[PDB]
UniProtKB/TrEMBL annotation:
PANTHER family attached to this UniProt entry: FI19380P1, PERIOSTIN-RELATED
Keyword annotations: Signal
A Pfam family assignment: Fasciclin
Protein name: Beta-Ig-H3/Fasciclin
Cellular-component GO terms for this entry: extracellular space
Domain of life per record: Bacteria
InterPro entries: Adhesion/Biosynth-related (IPR050904), FAS1_dom_sf (IPR036378), FAS1_domain (IPR000782)
Domain FAS1 stretches: 2-133
Amino acid sequence: ETGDIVETATGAGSFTTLLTAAEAAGLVDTLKGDGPFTVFAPTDAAFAALPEGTVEDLLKPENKEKLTEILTYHVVPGEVMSSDLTEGMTAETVEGGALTVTLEGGPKVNGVSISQPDVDASNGVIHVIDGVLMPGA
């Protein structure tokens, strides 16, 4: 595979409402355009977790435009998470924000759970959130 995070736009079956915008929001040059990059990619079932209006917002073409703006707080630089180091640390977003990262007692980031604790992406790092964690959206 090539593109890894960004190439999702090509397929996007599970991340069709989100990670398709990885390439298509102009994040392609960002995520695949360097090397190690870690993004909290929520699954199709995660949008079904908060389907009140968030999935509608994130289904609206409006969101990928602001994703262009807000990518930096959803994109974390190429650094290996607690699965390598130790659980119970703060991870910094490219925007410039430190979030809560702990696996012991429940893999939770900033108060949202990584219910499907993945990690090993092709170029970077993949973690499936069951919720959302960003400035506003």
